[PDB]
């Protein structure tokens, strides 16, 4: 009877949306993985089989110097104590940035998916673009604690 949202086969449908008031951002949520094909629409779940109720829901997206309304360009402005909202189907969950870190361009472990008691929302936003090697050197990924 109640709502029952589930990443369907419409890899083309936003599974939901995401916004942050302290960062002033509002964008769609497409199904993982954040592979180029998906990143073509919006912040996709850093992982394909992400769960609607995963102990850690990760998401990733490129950044834009000339565009703060991009995937995660205006995030660098948001920080701890930041109230984060996650909208999906007719349900609106909530998270609050509890931890933030960075790592070389290969620490995939950022997907950080272990804490379950207090689920979380692993944010992933790449930046520090290099023009010599033509690639992103530093990686930015914030974790958020479920509060709803």
């Amino acid at each position: 009877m109640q709502a029952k949202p589930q990443i369907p086969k419409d890899k083309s449908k936003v599974a939901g949306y995401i916004e942050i008031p302290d960062a002033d951002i509002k964008e769609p949520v497409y199904p993982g993985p954040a592979t180029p094909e998906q990143l073509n629409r919006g912040v996709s779940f850093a992982e394909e089989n992400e769960s609607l109720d995963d102990q850690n829901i990760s998401i990733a997206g490129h950044t834009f110097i000339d565009r703060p309304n991009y995937q995660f360009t205006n995030l660098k402005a948001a920080k701890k104590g930041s109230m984060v909202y996650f909208k999906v189907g007719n349900e609106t969950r909530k998270y609050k940035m509890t931890s933030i870190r960075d790592v070389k361009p290969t620490d995939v472990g950022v997907l950080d998916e272990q804490k379950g008691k207090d689920k979380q929302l692993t944010l992933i936003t790449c930046d520090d673009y290099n023009e010599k090697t033509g690639v992103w050197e530093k990686r930015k990924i914030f974790v958020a604690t479920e509060v709803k």
Partner: peptide
């Protein structure tokens, strides 16, 4: 880590 995804997101290039």
């Amino acid at each position: 880590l995804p997101a290039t």
